[PDB]
Amino acid sequence: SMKIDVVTIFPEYLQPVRQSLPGKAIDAGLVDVAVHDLRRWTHDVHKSVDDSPYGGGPGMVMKPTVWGDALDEICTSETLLVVPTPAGYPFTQETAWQWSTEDHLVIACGRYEGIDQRVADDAATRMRVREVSIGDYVLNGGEAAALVIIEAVLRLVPGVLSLLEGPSYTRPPSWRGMDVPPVLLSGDHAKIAAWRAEQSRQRTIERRPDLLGFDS
Amino acid sequence: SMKIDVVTIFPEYLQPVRQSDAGLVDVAVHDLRRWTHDVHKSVDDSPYGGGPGMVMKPTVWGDALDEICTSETLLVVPTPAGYPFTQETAWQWSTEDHLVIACGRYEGIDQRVADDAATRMRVREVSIGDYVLNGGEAAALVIIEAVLRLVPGVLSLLEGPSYTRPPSWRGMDVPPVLLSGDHAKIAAWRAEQSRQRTIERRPDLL
Ligand SMILES: Nc1ccc2nccnc2c1
Numbered sequence A: 001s002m003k004i005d006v007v008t009i010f011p012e013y014l015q016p017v018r019q020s021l022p023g024k025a026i027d028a029g030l031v032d033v034a035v036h037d038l039r040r041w042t043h044d045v046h047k048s049v050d051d052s053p054y055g056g057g058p059g060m061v062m063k064p065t066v067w068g069d070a071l072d073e074i075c076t077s078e079t080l081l082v083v084p085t086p087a088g089y090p091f092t093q094e095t096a097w098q099w100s101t102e103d104h105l106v107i108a109c110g111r112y113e114g115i116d117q118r119v120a121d122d123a124a125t126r127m128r129v130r131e132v133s134i135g136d137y138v139l140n141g142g143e144a145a146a147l148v149i150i151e152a153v154l155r156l157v158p159g160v161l162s163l164l165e166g167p168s169y170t171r172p173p174s175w176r177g178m179d180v181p182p183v184l185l186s187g188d189h190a191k192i193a194a195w196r197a198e199q200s201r202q203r204t205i206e207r208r209p210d211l212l213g214f215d216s
Numbered sequence B: 001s002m003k004i005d006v007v008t009i010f011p012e013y014l015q016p017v018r019q020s021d022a023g024l025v026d027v028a029v030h031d032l033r034r035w036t037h038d039v040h041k042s043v044d045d046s047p048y049g050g051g052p053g054m055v056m057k058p059t060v061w062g063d064a065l066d067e068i069c070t071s072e073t074l075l076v077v078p079t080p081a082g083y084p085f086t087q088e089t090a091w092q093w094s095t096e097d098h099l100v101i102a103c104g105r106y107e108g109i110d111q112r113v114a115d116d117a118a119t120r121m122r123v124r125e126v127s128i129g130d131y132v133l134n135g136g137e138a139a140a141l142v143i144i145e146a147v148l149r150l151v152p153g154v155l156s157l158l159e160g161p162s163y164t165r166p167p168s169w170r171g172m173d174v175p176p177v178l179l180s181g182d183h184a185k186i187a188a189w190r191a192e193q194s195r196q197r198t199i200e201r202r203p204d205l206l
């Protein structure tokens, strides 16, 4: 039984949560996901969540006042506050396993430019805070990163049921003149294991040499 | 002018991205089950050579891509076994006329689909990261967003901390250098902040 709160200025964008793995998890009552519009915690008539950065630079920074009020209401001392950001620690499969046993995740989604640093500083006096990057590409905002984190974590939650995977095949055994590798049809568990290992080796060394401790 | 076609068994998943309005991209989402052959609308089957999970059927994907792709298409297949998707990749793809993104489950699509497609068109199998998702839909979302923000009209080292009003909040002041009006010094301070944060969070970048 896990609770996930997502805070965003684009709550309708978190709707893809409702299908696939996360939707089934919610429907089965293993997790509850609640999405909050950040502007709920604004008090000016224009619902302003951002302002220009001190020191200059392009873009805007999300205001600490609004985030502070939001997180005051949503978070407790047991909360794990997740802040997706291009400047975060890497989010890995190990991170996913670690967070899969948490009672309460709060995910704060900002734009790329980011949230005033003092929000995370202030929250860390009260709760555990993790700023993480899902990758070294650039998104407009944290919302898509939130969906990725949620999907990676939820599939590891109890109750929701190295080397690259090599190629996989299914019926029919010949298709457009391309045959499935005969060893896979042979029913020889040993030779199949050997073949799959060799395929995975070739693929990892070609596509992800870093996984085996090589350059690039 | 970019066209993106996405093929998925969860078409609802992708509808929220389609809302940017400028009309410079077209993003179309297609339900893979449109191309199934049987009344049960089967999209996957047991893997040859045994093992857990299911593999998506070549006959179904073959029909879908035949209808949707042309020789000009860049066929993107998100997969944990892919080449890394990077910002360099996003820049490259941002000038393409036609991307087709084939979303499959973790276990993947029969390899003959991509192998066959690669005899007629460019195919790119890519991973958005080394965590495991159940399906490629979230990865497609990440890819679409990273690419489209580089298409004009939609509008190293880590970035260090940023600050805005008010100057003092809950007992913490904005670093005074940022208010100094010494812009060379501010740049140096930010560069040192970046160095420190990169060392701490992403030493791989050095
Ligand atoms: N909040 C954000 C904004 C953009 C991002 N781009 C890549 C990875 N994480 C991100 C988080």
Ligand SMILES: Nc1ccc2nccnc2c1
Binding pocket: B078, B079, B080, B103, B104, B105, B106, B107, B126, B127, B128, B129, B130, B131, B132, B133, B134, B135, B136, B137, B139
């Ligand atoms: N098609 C898929 C399925 C799962 C994934 N997990 C991580 C990265 N890419 C993925 C693509």
